[PDB]
Amino acid sequence: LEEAPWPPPEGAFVGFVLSRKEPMWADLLALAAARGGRVHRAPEPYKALRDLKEARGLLAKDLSVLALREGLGLPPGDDPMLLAYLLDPSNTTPEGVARRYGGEWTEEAGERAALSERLFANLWGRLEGEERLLWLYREVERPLSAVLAHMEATGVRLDVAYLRALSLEVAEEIARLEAEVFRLAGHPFNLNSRDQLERVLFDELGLPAIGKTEKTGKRSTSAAVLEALREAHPIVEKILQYRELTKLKSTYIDPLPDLIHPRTGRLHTRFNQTATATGRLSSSDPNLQNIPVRTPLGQRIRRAFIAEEGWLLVALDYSQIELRVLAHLSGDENLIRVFQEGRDIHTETASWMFGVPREAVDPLMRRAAKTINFGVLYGMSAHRLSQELAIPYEEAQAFIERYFQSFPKVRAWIEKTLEEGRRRGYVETLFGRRRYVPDLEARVKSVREAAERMAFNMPVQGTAADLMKLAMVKLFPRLEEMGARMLLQVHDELVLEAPKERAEAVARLAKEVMEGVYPLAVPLEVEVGIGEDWLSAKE
DNA sequence: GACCACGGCGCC
DNA sequence: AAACGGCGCCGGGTC
Numbered sequence: 001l002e003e004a005p006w007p008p009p010e011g012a013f014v015g016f017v018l019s020r021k022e023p024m025w026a027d028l029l030a031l032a033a034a035r036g037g038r039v040h041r042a043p044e045p046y047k048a049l050r051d052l053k054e055a056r057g058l059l060a061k062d063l064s065v066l067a068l069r070e071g072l073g074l075p076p077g078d079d080p081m082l083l084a085y086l087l088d089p090s091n092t093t094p095e096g097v098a099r100r101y102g103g104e105w106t107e108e109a110g111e112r113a114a115l116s117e118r119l120f121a122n123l124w125g126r127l128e129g130e131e132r133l134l135w136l137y138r139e140v141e142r143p144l145s146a147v148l149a150h151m152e153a154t155g156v157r158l159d160v161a162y163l164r165a166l167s168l169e170v171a172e173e174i175a176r177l178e179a180e181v182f183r184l185a186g187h188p189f190n191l192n193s194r195d196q197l198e199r200v201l202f203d204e205l206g207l208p209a210i211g212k213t214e215k216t217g218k219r220s221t222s223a224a225v226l227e228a229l230r231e232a233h234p235i236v237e238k239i240l241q242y243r244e245l246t247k248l249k250s251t252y253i254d255p256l257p258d259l260i261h262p263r264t265g266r267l268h269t270r271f272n273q274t275a276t277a278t279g280r281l282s283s284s285d286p287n288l289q290n291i292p293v294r295t296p297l298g299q300r301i302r303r304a305f306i307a308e309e310g311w312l313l314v315a316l317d318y319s320q321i322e323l324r325v326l327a328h329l330s331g332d333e334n335l336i337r338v339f340q341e342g343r344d345i346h347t348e349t350a351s352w353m354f355g356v357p358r359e360a361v362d363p364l365m366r367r368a369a370k371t372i373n374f375g376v377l378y379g380m381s382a383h384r385l386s387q388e389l390a391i392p393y394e395e396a397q398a399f400i401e402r403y404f405q406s407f408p409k410v411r412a413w414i415e416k417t418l419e420e421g422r423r424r425g426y427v428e429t430l431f432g433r434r435r436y437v438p439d440l441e442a443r444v445k446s447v448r449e450a451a452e453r454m455a456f457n458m459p460v461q462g463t464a465a466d467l468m469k470l471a472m473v474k475l476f477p478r479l480e481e482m483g484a485r486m487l488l489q490v491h492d493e494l495v496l497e498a499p500k501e502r503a504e505a506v507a508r509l510a511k512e513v514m515e516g517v518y519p520l521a522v523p524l525e526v527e528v529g530i531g532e533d534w535l536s537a538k539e
Numbered sequence: 540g541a542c543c544a545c546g547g548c549g550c551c
Numbered sequence: 552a553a554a555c556g557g558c559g560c561c562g563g564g565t566c
């Protein structure tokens with residue numbers, strides 16, 4: 001390309017090199033831009049950010065986030081990763097996309113600008129005639145990238161002192177457990193080593209092996225195995241308690257306080273827009289989509305996620321979302337009616353399965369009923385369903401056959417979906433997001449059947465993801481104008497921050513936007529709550 | 540130090 | 552584990 005002085009004209013494709021992948025923590029090492037046969041390299045990349053009107057190119061969102069960190073309003077625009085990811089969601093990395101669509105991801109910003117420009121040209125070509133994908137790009141993914149840049153740059157407030165204090169208390173309770181385990185073993189070992197634990201449980205204590213591990217065929221020590229073994233020996237209960245505590249401490253209590261950003265005083269995740277096979281977002285560095293919520297200690301952790309002083313969190317979560325989506329996709333008259341009538345399938349299952357009235361169903365029971373309801377739907381075995389309730393291969397199954405014959409268009413929807421996927425090589429969401437599933441004609445039954453469950457799950461999980469993305473795009477500007485913030489997405493949930501005085505109004509508005517995003521054959525209901533912390537805002 | 544593959548497990 | 556799906560982060564062998 002012809003070498004040309006910095007600054008580029010309007011509409012050029014940017015290339016940029018970061019010291020590390022996380023845009024909130026990165027040093028911008030280099031910046032360049034490409035357009036009309038010319039490449040322009042920035043002498044001083046931070047100053048040079050100020051000359052751009054938008055970030056247009058590979059990983060546009062990440063540069064935008066870095067710009068926002070520096071007080072610049074540089075929105076992301078076209079990004080070939082989003083075009084590629086819509087063509088085939090196994091397109092997840094710039095190395096891969098480049099190789100597939102016409103160049104090489106190098107460590108030079110100029111080359112990255114040039115690559116961005118030519119990959120955009122090519123990928124735009126490939127989306128010719130692909131009207132549903134183009135709609136997804138223009139109406140969902142491209143505008144969503146700007147929303148995600150703001151969310152990443154804004155961050156969430158964390159009660160650091162609370163977590164530090166909690167760490168010290170949890171350390172003591174862990175020592176009590178590990179000491180008991182070692183006493184019961186008759187010797188110490190590394191309790192964090194599942195290989196050492198395997199030897200102790202099954203060789204030294206002679207407990208029965210239940211299951212084997214997937215890749216290397218060891219005797220499993222997983223929670224399902226230990227649960228089965230609870231009454232065999234008192235060590236097993238102590239191992240389960242130890243695992244619960246150490247998981248929480250090593251994954252959340254300890255690391256999160258050290259990730260507070262020195263200039264914002266907040267915690268900044270990354271929302272990865274080209275990372276899943278179904279069209280969901282992911283969250284990393286750290287992951288804020290798997291913050292604990294279920295156990296007593298997990299609830300304590302979730303309490304550390306708090307609002308700015310004088311603000312409240314507003315948590316909004318779609319009710320029974322994949323079930324509603326499935327009603328629409330299958331057009332099943334019975335399931336449509338269940339929702340027309342305001343029923344709750346999770347609560348009904350929980351009530352039935354624990355034998356208590358609906359008013360006695362607690363959050364733990366509701367979570368177990370979800371496992372049941374989504375499990376059966378997405379192809380859980382009669383064998384595992386036996387054990388989950390868990391009662392027997394008698395009335396563990398039969399249950400599947402009734403579940404399905406109640407909703408006869410579901411079976412037909414699955415079979416239509418699978419037969420389409422075999423012929424086409426892909427399945428799709430309501431909006432035409434695609435997932436290629438080639439193993440549908442595999443000849444190893446276990447491989448083929450795994451593929452099938454992947455394949456029919458995707459239109460449901462993926463349509464739910466499309467809806468949430470669209471809600472985000474519609475909701476974001478409404479929040480800006482109200483002086484509220486969008487903080488987190490958790491698949492079917494949004495966490496917002498609002499000034500106390502406006503929090504109620506924000507909650508109503510956000511709820512209505514999410515409920516009316518794209519009407520289906522059943523209502524979408526959203527549960528909304530407000531509080532000083534993320535837990536109180538869902539309670 | 541960082542890489543991976545694994546088992547394991549947190550959330551949706 | 553058990554053949555529900557989708558993720559990302561934690562703590563033996565290698566380089």
Ligand SMILES: Nc1nc2c(ncn2[C@H]2C[C@H](O)[C@@H](COP(=O)(O)OP(=O)(O)OP(=O)(O)O)O2)c(=O)[nH]1
Pocket residue numbers: 317318319320321322323346370371374375378491492551555556
């Ligand atoms: N296949 C599968 N999908 C799940 C599972 N747990 C959650 N999901 C998917 C389906 C849910 O509809 C969606 C959102 O999770 P939620 O915990 O909000 O559940 P849901 O919206 O169904 O119920 P809610 O009324 O919000 O409690 O994520 C699971 O165990 N298996």
Ligand SMILES: [Mg+2]
Pocket residue numbers: 317318319320321492
């Ligand atoms: Mg929900």
Ligand SMILES: [Mg+2]
Pocket residue numbers: 317318490492493551
């Ligand atoms: Mg949810």
Ligand SMILES: [Mg+2]
Pocket residue numbers: none
């Ligand atoms: Mg893994």
